[PDB]
Subunit: 79 residues, 4 copies
């Protein structure tokens, strides 16, 4: 079971994690606000999110996969 | 081709978003460090994560939902 | 690149996968219908889905995890 | 405690759902077997899955969206 010490520790784990989860939500909300402003100024949010997605990935692997993709699409007449 | 105005604003958007994402990554890292510390003290990280998930809903509705679960589980043997 | 043979193969992969994905959607829709009927007859859908969830998991691991869970919850006064 | 009526219907619901789930599992297995076969013939399963995902949307809007992407990617260098 959990003793006085372990009980105290457990409480701290939950409280610490919960505080951080709140901060994570604040950041997530701020990111949503940025996209909201961008949409208001005429930018395509979906495309913006893909730009951020692409920039996260390794360039070498991204360019290689995009190459194989174009091959398959044109093979079945899609690009 | 986007003009200088749209170009300059596009860069600021991506730069800003990417900044928040790193800030979010830091927070996610801190959450891992707590669970990693807990695991070191003999805690079950998987169970801990569920407790946090459980605590998102109030205790009343929690036990009410679980009462129906046991009612169903006992009914089907 | 893709030759005549590989091009023919690729087309078959996409068509075969796409047909199966359609069937997967039919099943998923049928599952939704069952829950719709259950809800109509007074059953809590959320609880039902958890019953199916529990029954999928290994009983030994499930019972062990549920045991550790009750320990932690009562330690911080939640159960 | 649920009565005989609610009990009997509860069992049928879970039994039915669980049956559909296995049927769904079979279909998911068949999809894996195709990709496993494709990989054997030298295809890239990850790319194949994207093609199926791409084909869900029509070619017109596809290339329209990608045109904006390149416009944005070139603007930010």
């Amino acid at each position: 079971v959990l003793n006085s010490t372990a009980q105290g520790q457990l409480k701290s784990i939950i409280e610490r994690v919960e505080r951080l989860e709140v901060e994570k939500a604040e950041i997530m909300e701020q990111i949503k606000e940025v996209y909201a402003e961008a949409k208001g100024n005429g930018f395509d949010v979906k495309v913006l999110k893909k730009v951020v997605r692409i920039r996260k990935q390794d360039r070498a692997k991204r360019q290689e996969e995009d190459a194989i993709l174009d091959l398959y699409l044109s093979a079945i007449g899609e690009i």
